[PDB]
């Protein structure tokens, strides 16, 4: 009947009230978020005179538990990067309020998702595309430092914010499905759009697979839909064998999901296993077609816009190549990546 006094809900969440005032320095403004872990509020802070971001974690200990691990990993990357420079959201601070966890993080405008919506699902031009790519590689690097080693396991649109809707500069947030490499626990991870082939097929992975989802997204910030929409995990292997081919025969004989996407033949190679209710044969929609990189970028589009030769399609159609290969030990790294033609 009554939950936290009258505070919370029957779903575990904060009331949130326009107008309200939390500990005589927190102004709450409006709901702009609500997720699995809780909810996000717009704040102004009197304290410091600015606008912050309170994630509102849920009063339950499932995702209090959850939210403490995410609490680690920010204050450990504030350690390491002091200047602000890496392209990670900022955790200014955390503090308990009426049996909640709250975190207070640095106000930014909208997604990658909203930027796509507002192109009409049309992709924005090379140039952008090439400012986004450089900043989220610098922060993979800024993840892959050794004493950091922290796979994001779960980039998306969704998962970029914009700093400010007039100007090109990029972070990354929601580190709560985040952790640092090493023995695997868990094996569903990732949104299916973004997922690498190494954990649809059940295998090791290490900070490789946020590389994958990076070679996924760019093509989608381009064109503006997403590169491989699987609508389960069968469609979505499918799609992935349609632009890349067959995976090597020597990682499918090691993968314990194979059979649930491959058959092994007498002669020992793998093919594809038929479907109830139309894939068009490994490896023919190539991704120089898919970017149209002799007949003026995604739909025709492009064609006669500066920074859109087919030259510059080449730098970019070669960078997702190497983001994309299957073998997650010789895809690229975001230091060489970094040191890419499409940079220069
Ligand atoms: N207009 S909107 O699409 O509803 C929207 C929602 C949240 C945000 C926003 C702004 N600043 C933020 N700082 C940290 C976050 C954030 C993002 C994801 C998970 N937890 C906090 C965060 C989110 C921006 C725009």
């Known amino acids: 009947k009554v939950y936290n006094d009258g505070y919370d809900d029957d779903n575990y969440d904060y009331i949130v009230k326009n107008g309200e005032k939390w500990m005589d320095r927190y102004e709450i403004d409006s709901?702009?978020?609500?997720?699995?872990?809780?909810?996000?509020?717009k704040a102004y802070d009197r304290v410091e005179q600015e606008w912050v971001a309170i994630k509102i974690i849920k009063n339950k200990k499932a995702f209090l538990n959850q939210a403490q691990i995410e609490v680690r990993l920010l204050e450990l990357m504030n350690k390491?990067?002091?200047?602000?420079?890496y392209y990670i959201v900022h955790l200014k601070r955390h503090f308990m309020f009426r049996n909640h966890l709250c975190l207070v993080f640095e106000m930014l405008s909208y997604?990658?998702?909203?930027?796509?919506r507002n192109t009409n699902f049309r992709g924005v031009s090379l140039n952008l595309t090439r400012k986004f790519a450089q900043q989220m590689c610098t922060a993979l690097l800024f993840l892959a430092?050794?004493?950091?080693?922290?796979?994001?396991?779960?980039?998306?649109?969704?998962?970029?914010?914009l700093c400010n809707p007039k100007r090109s500069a990029i972070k990354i947030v929601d580190f709560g499905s985040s952790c640092q490499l090493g023995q695997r626990i868990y094996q569903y991870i990732q949104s299916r759009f973004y997922r690498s082939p190494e954990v649809l097929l059940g295998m090791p992975y290490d900070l490789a697979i946020d590389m994958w989802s990076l070679g996924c997204?760019?093509?989608?910030?381009?064109?503006?839909?997403?590169?491989?929409?699987?609508?389960?995990?069968?469609?979505?292997?499918?799609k992935i064998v349609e632009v890349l081919g067959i995976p090597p025969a020597h990682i499918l004989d090691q993968a314990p999901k194979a059979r649930k996407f491959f058959?092994?033949?007498?002669?020992?190679?793998?093919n594809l296993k038929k479907t109830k209710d139309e894939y068009k044969?490994?490896?023919?929609?190539?991704?120089?077609?898919?970017?149209?990189?002799?007949t003026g970028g995604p739909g025709g589009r492009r064609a006669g816009e500066?920074?859109?030769?087919?030259?510059?399609?080449?730098?970019?159609?070669?960078?997702?190549?190497?983001?994309?290969?299957?073998?997650?030990?010789?895809?690229?790294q975001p230091y060489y990546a970094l040191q890419h033609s499409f940079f220069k």
């Not at 997604?111 to 796509?116: E, H, P, Q, R, V």
């Not at 430092?145 to 914010?161: F, G, M, V, Y």
């Not at 058959?263 to 793998?270: A, F, I, N, R």
Request: proline share 6%; net charge negative.
């Open 80 to 85: 390491h990067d002091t200047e602000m420079k």
């Open 281 to 294: 044969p490994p490896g023919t929609r190539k991704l120089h077609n898919i970017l149209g990189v002799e």
């Open 145 to 161: 430092t050794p004493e950091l080693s922290i796979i994001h396991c779960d980039l998306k649109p969704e998962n970029i914010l």
């Open 111 to 116: 997604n990658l998702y909203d930027l796509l």
């Open 263 to 270: 058959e092994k033949l007498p002669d020992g190679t793998w």
């Open 31 to 41: 709901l702009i978020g609500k997720g699995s872990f809780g909810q996000v509020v």
């Open 306 to 332: 500066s920074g859109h030769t087919v030259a510059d399609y080449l730098k970019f159609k070669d960078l997702i190549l190497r983001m994309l290969d299957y073998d997650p030990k010789t895809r690229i």
């Open 217 to 238: 997204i760019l093509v989608e910030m381009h064109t503006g839909e997403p590169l491989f929409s699987g609508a389960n995990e069968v469609d979505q292997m499918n």
